[PDB]
Amino acid sequence: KSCHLEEGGEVEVSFEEKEMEKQRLLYQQSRLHTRGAAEM
């Protein structure tokens, strides 16, 4: 639920939004410890 909420909840369709959102989602995924958790 946290990762889903951190998808589009925080029209224009510009590079100022299509890249900030992608970087934020990547940071959210990395903060979840992709290493270790995938094997779990």
Side-chain angles (χ1 to χ4, degrees), residues 1-5 7-9 11-40:
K1 214 162 278 187
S2 77
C3 186
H4 268 196
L5 188 142
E7 274 198 1
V11 183
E12 175 192 5
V13 194
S14 77
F15 293 99
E16 209 66 39
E17 203 268 342
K18 286 292 291 295
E19 295 297 324
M20 183 63 200
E21 183 269 335
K22 203 67 60 182
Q23 203 255 340
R24 256 187 51 180
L25 190 142
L26 203 64
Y27 177 72
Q28 285 289 331
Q29 272 173 355
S30 170
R31 208 179 60 190
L32 194 142
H33 281 280
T34 60
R35 73 281 195 193
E39 302 93 306
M40 181 274 258

